[PDB]
């Protein structure tokens, strides 16, 4: 049980790092599509093409 | 006296045989308990994983 807990803790941190970065990568594509998504939302709320 | 000597020797031999059987069954039970607890430990480790 102790060995399993230690290995799972190590895996978790490894995963925490990998996630973190994976998220930064995606954060980029996110900022690329933000403009189009915001334009679509503005058009929706205004009831007509922005 | 002769019967008692023979029966005492027979009782000691029977005690030896009973002890042999008892310790064999004890080793069997030790193996069974070890297998059960190792299986439990493996199941718990797999659950933690």
From Swiss-Prot, chain A:
| The family this protein is said to belong to | Belongs to the ATPase B chain family.
Q: Where is this region: Disordered?
A: 7-33
- The Polar residues compositionally biased stretches are 8-25
What is the name listed in the Swiss-Prot or TrEMBL entry for this protein?
A: ATP synthase subunit b
Q: Does the keyword 4Fe-4S apply?
A: no
Q: Which GO terms describe its cellular component?
A: plasma membrane; proton-transporting ATP synthase complex
**Its job:** F(1)F(0) ATP synthase produces ATP from ADP in the presence of a proton or sodium gradient. F-type ATPases consist of two structural domains, F(1) containing the extramembraneous catalytic core and F(0) containing the membrane proton channel, linked together by a central stalk and a peripheral stalk. During catalysis, ATP synthesis in the catalytic domain of F(1) is coupled via a rotary mechanism of the central stalk subunits to proton translocation. Component of the F(0) channel, it forms part of the peripheral stalk, linking F(1) to F(0).
Full-protein interval shown: 115 to 164 of 170
Entry keywords, A to Z: ATP synthesis, Cell membrane, CF(0), Hydrogen ion transport, Ion transport, Membrane, Transmembrane, Transmembrane helix, Transport
Give coiled-coil spans as residue ranges: none
**What's the chief localization of this chain?**
membrane
From Swiss-Prot, chain B:
**Where is this protein found?**
Cell membrane
In terms of superkingdom, the source organism counts as Bacteria
Subunit structure of this chain's protein:
F-type ATPases have 2 components, F(1) - the catalytic core - and F(0) - the membrane proton channel. F(1) has five subunits: alpha(3), beta(3), gamma(1), delta(1), epsilon(1). F(0) has three main subunits: a(1), b(2) and c(10-14). The alpha and beta chains form an alternating ring which encloses part of the gamma chain. F(1) is attached to F(0) by a central stalk formed by the gamma and epsilon chains, while a peripheral stalk is formed by the delta and b chains.
Give the family from UniProt: In the N-terminal section; belongs to the ATPase B chain family.
Described purpose of this protein according to its UniProt entry = F(1)F(0) ATP synthase produces ATP from ADP in the presence of a proton or sodium gradient. F-type ATPases consist of two structural domains, F(1) containing the extramembraneous catalytic core and F(0) containing the membrane proton channel, linked together by a central stalk and a peripheral stalk. During catalysis, ATP synthesis in the catalytic domain of F(1) is coupled via a rotary mechanism of the central stalk subunits to proton translocation.
Q: What else is known?
A: Binds 2-aminothiazole antibiotics, which are antitubercular agents.
Q: What is this protein called?
A: ATP synthase subunit b-delta
Q: Which organism is it from?
A: Mycolicibacterium smegmatis (strain ATCC 700084 / mc(2)155)
Query: What lineage, starting at the top, does this entry show?
Result: Bacteria, Bacillati, Actinomycetota, Actinomycetes, Mycobacteriales
Q: Covered range within the whole protein?
A: 51 to 99 of 445
């Amino acid at each position: 049980r102790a060995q399993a807990s230690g290995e799972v803790a190590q895996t978790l941190t490894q995963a925490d790092q990998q996630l973190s970065a994976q998220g930064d990568q995606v954060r980029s594509g996110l900022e690329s599509s933000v403009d189009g998504l915001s334009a679509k939302l503005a058009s929706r709320i205004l009831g007509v093409d922005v | 006296l002769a019967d008692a000597d023979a029966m005492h020797a027979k009782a000691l031999a029977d005690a030896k045989a009973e002890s042999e059987k008892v310790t064999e069954e004890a080793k069997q039970d030790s193996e069974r308990i070890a297998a059960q607890l190792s299986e439990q430990a493996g199941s718990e480790a797999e659950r933690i994983k």
